[PDB]
C-alpha cells in the first residue's frame, strides 16, 4: 500500500469523513477548499468538473446543514456582494467523535438509574445533529403527540443547563478571524482624527477596545440569561421553544480533557486517591478554563510583549476564578470525614506533578497552565517505551534534563555499553526525538572534522507525532470503506429485508473484524487528542 503512505497529509483524513457516511458528491468539494484555502462559488465550478453550478449549491447545502463549512460575506465598492466560503474544522470533528458523545451523556449524567429514556437520551444526540440544526418544535411534532412529552421536554433543561447545548448563531457558523477584522475596524472608526498625540498608541486604542469586545461577544452565546422561559402555567421552568441549538464541542473537549488527567492519577497513585480525585474533578468540569484558547488563535502572537499577555492574565483568571476554588469541605458529602478529605489530598501537593500543588491555605484548586505541558511530556516518553525499547526511555530522559549533551557525557550520565546505544539512538534521529548540533572546528564545515551535539527540541518532536497519528486514523478509516466494497451484494440483501444458510457465514467474519476497528480507533483517538492542548 505504498501509494497511500506517501501523498497524504491531513487532507486524506478530512476528505474521507464525508466519504464515510454521506453522499459521494461532497467528498470532492471538501477536498478543494482544504487544498486551495478559500474560494467562492464563482471560482469553485472552474476548479471541480462534473457538478453543475446549482448542483454545487445542491451539494453545498448538505454540509451547510451539518455545519461542516463556515462562510464569509465581503462586498466591493464597485462589485456585488461576494460570499467567500471557508472550511469548518470542528464541525467535522463531530463526525469523528460521533459515538463518543453517547458514552459522555451516560458517564456524566448519573442521577438517574434504570430510566425509560436510556434508549431515548442516546437518540437525542442522534436527533439533534444528524438532522443538522435542531429546534424544540422538531421533536414534539414527532409521531408521539404527548407520550408524556412534558416530562421529556423538562428533561432537557437538565440536559442543557449542564452545558454543551449552546444556541447556535452566526458566531458558531463564522470563523474566528473574519469576525475580528470589522469589529477592530468598528473600534477604529470610533476614534477619529483630532487626537495626534501618541498615534502608535492610538492605533492600539481600538485594540484595547477589541480585547474587551472579543471576550464579550464570545460570551453572548454562552450567556445563559436568554436561553430559558419562565412559564407561569403548567410548568415551573423551561427553555425557550424558539431556540435553534446544536451541541457544543467546548464542554465535551474540556470534559474529554478531564478524563485524560485522571488516567495519570491511576498511574501515579493507587485505587483510593484516584477515586477521591475523580469526584472533585467532576465538579469543576462545567466551568473550566478553555482548551482551545480563542485569544491565541490568530492575532498579535508574533510580539512577545503581547504574547506574554495571553498567559499573564490567563493565569490570573485561572487563579482568581471563584467557580473552581473548592474549600475541600464539600467533598465529603459528594463521596458515597474532612480529616481524610485533607489527608488524602495531602498526597496531591507532595508529588512533583503540579495538580493541587499551589493554593491559598484553606482553599484548594487544580492549576491548568503549568499542568498540561507535563502530561504531554509524560505519555510520549511512555509511548517510546511502549512500541520500542526501554533503553530509549533512558536516553530520552537523559537528553531531556541535560541540555546540549555530548557523546562523552552520554556515557558519563547514562550507563550502558557502547554498541547498544548506536542501535537505539539511530532510530531516534529517524523519528525526531533527538536532533543534531554541529561545531565547525575546520574550514567550510568539514563533516569528518566535526563532533555532533544533541537536543530535545520540544516542538518538532510533537509535530511529527500529530501527522503520524492523523494518517494512522485515516489509514484505519481507509480499511473500513474498502471492506464494504466487496461482499456488497448481500449487504444490499441485508438492507432489503428489514436466507441462504452458508452465505450468512461470510457476513459475520467480516462484521467481527470491523468491530475491532472501532475499538482500536477509540484507543488510538485518545492518544492523539492529548496533543491538541496547544
Amino acid at each position: 500500500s505504498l501509494e497511500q503512505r506517501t501523498l497524504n497529509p491531513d487532507l486524506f483524513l478530512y476528505k474521507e469523513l464525508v466519504k464515510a457516511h454521506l453522499g459521494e458528491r461532497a467528498a470532492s468539494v471538501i477536498g478543494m477548499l482544504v487544498a486551495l484555502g478559500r474560494l467562492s462559488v464563482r471560482e469553485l465550478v472552474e476548479k471541480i468538473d462534473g457538478m453543475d453550478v446549482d448542483s454545487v449549491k445542491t451539494t453545498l447545502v448538505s454540509l451547510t446543514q451539518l455545519r461542516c463549512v463556515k462562510y464569509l460575506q465581503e462586498t466591493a465598492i464597485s462589485g456585488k456582494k461576494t460570499t467567500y466560503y471557508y472550511y469548518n474544522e470542528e464541525g467535522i470533528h463531530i463526525l469523528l467523535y460521533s459515538g463518543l458523545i453517547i458514552d459522555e451523556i451516560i458517564t456524566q449524567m448519573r442521577v438517574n438509574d434504570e430510566e425509560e429514556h436510556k434508549q431515548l437520551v442516546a437518540e437525542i444526540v442522534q436527533n439533534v445533529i444528524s438532522l443538522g440544526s435542531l429546534t424544540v418544535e422538531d421533536y414534539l411534532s414527532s409521531v408521539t403527540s404527548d407520550s408524556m412529552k412534558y416530562t421529556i421536554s423538562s428533561l432537557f433543561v437538565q440536559l442543557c443547563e449542564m452545558g454543551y447545548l449552546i444556541q447556535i448563531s452566526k458566531l458558531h457558523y463564522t470563523p474566528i478571524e473574519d469576525l475580528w477584522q470589522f469589529l477592530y475596524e468598528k473600534h477604529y472608526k470610533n476614534i477619529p482624527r483630532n487626537s495626534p498625540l501618541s498615534d502608535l498608541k492610538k492605533r492600539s486604542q481600538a485594540k484595547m477596545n477589541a480585547k474587551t469586545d472579543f471576550a464579550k461577544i464570545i460570551n453572548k452565546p454562552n450567556e445563559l440569561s436568554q436561553i430559558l422561559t419562565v412559564d407561569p402555567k403548567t410548568s415551573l421552568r423551561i427553555v425557550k421553544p424558539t431556540v435553534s441549538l446544536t451541541i457544543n464541542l467546548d464542554r465535551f473537549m474540556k470534559g474529554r480533557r478531564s478524563k485524560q488527567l485522571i488516567n495519570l492519577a491511576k498511574t501515579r497513585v493507587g485505587s483510593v486517591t484516584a477515586q477521591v480525585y475523580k469526584i472533585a474533578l467532576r465538579l469543576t468540569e462545567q466551568k473550566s478554563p478553555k482548551i482551545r484558547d480563542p485569544l491565541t488563535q490568530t492575532g498579535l502572537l508574533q510580539d512577545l510583549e503581547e504574547a506574554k499577555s495571553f498567559q499573564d492574565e490567563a493565569e490570573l483568571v485561572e487563579e482568581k476564578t471563584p467557580g473552581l476554588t473548592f474549600n475541600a469541605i464539600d467533598l465529603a458529602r459528594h463521596l458515597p470525614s474532612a480529616s481524610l478529605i485533607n489527608s488524602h489530598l495531602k498526597i496531591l501537593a507532595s508529588s512533583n506533578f503540579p495538580f493541587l500543588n499551589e493554593t491559598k491555605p484553606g482553599v484548594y484548586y487544580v492549576p491548568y497552565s503549568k499542568l498540561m505541558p507535563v502530561l504531554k511530556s509524560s505519555v510520549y516518553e511512555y509511548v517510546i517505551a511502549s512500541t520500542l525499547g526501554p533503553s530509549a526511555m533512558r536516553l530520552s530522559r537523559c537528553i531531556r534534563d541535560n541540555k546540549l549533551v555530548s557523546e562523552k557525557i552520554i556515557n558519563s550520565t547514562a550507563l550502558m555499553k557502547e554498541k547498544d546505544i548506536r542501535s537505539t539512538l539511530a532510530s531516534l534521529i529517524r523519528y525526531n526525538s533527538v536532533e543534531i548540533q554541529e561545531v565547525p572546528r575546520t574550514a567550510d564545515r568539514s563533516a569528518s572534522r566535526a563532533v555532533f551535539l544533541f537536543r530535545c527540541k520540544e516542538t518538532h518532536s510533537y509535530n511529527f507525532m500529530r501527522q503520524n497519528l492523523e494518517w494512522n486514523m485515516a489509514n484505519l478509516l481507509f480499511k473500513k470503506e474498502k471492506l464494504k466494497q466487496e461482499n456488497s451484494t448481500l449487504l444490499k440483501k441485508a438492507n432489503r429485508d428489514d436466507l441462504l444458510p452458508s452465505e450468512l457465514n461470510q457476513l459475520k467474519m467480516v462484521n467481527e473484524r470491523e468491530l475491532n476497528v472501532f475499538a482500536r480507533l477509540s484507543r488510538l483517538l485518545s492518544l492523539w487528542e492529548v496533543f491538541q492542548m496547544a
Partner: protein, 99 residues
C-alpha cells in the same frame, strides 16, 4: 564504575530499599556482603540518576528520594497484559512504514 556489566545487580537492590520507604544508601550498600571494593557518595549519586531516567524513583527536595510506584506496574499506560494477535490479521497498526 567498571565498564563491564552487573551494575544492574547494584541497581535492582536499591530500588527495593526505597519502595518500602542520599546518606541512607551508603550504609545499606555496605551491608549484605555486596561484591564492591570502593563506595563513594559520587557514585551513589551517579547510580541514582539512571533510576530517574527509568522513572523507577522520584527526586524531591534536591536530596530526598521517593518511588513513582513503578512496582505496581512491575508486579492507558498499561503496556503489559496487552498481547497482539499478529497472525492472519491484516488490519494491524504499525509505527514504521510512514517515514
Amino acid at each position: 564504575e567498571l565498564d563491564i556489566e552487573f551494575i544492574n545487580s547494584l541497581l535492582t537492590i536499591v530500588w527495593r530499599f526505597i519502595s518500602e520507604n542520599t546518606q541512607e544508601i551508603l550504609e545499606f550498600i555496605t551491608a549484605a556482603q555486596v561484591a564492591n571494593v570502593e563506595l563513594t557518595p559520587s557514585n551513589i549519586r551517579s547510580l541514582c540518576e539512571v533510576l530517574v531516567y527509568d522513572d523507577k524513583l522520584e527526586k524531591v527536595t534536591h536530596d530526598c528520594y521517593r518511588v513513582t510506584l513503578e512496582s505496581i506496574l512491575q508486579m492507558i499506560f498499561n503496556y503489559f497484559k496487552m498481547f497482539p494477535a499478529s497472525k492472519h490479521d491484516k488490519e494491524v497498526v504499525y509505527f514504521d512504514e510512514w517515514t
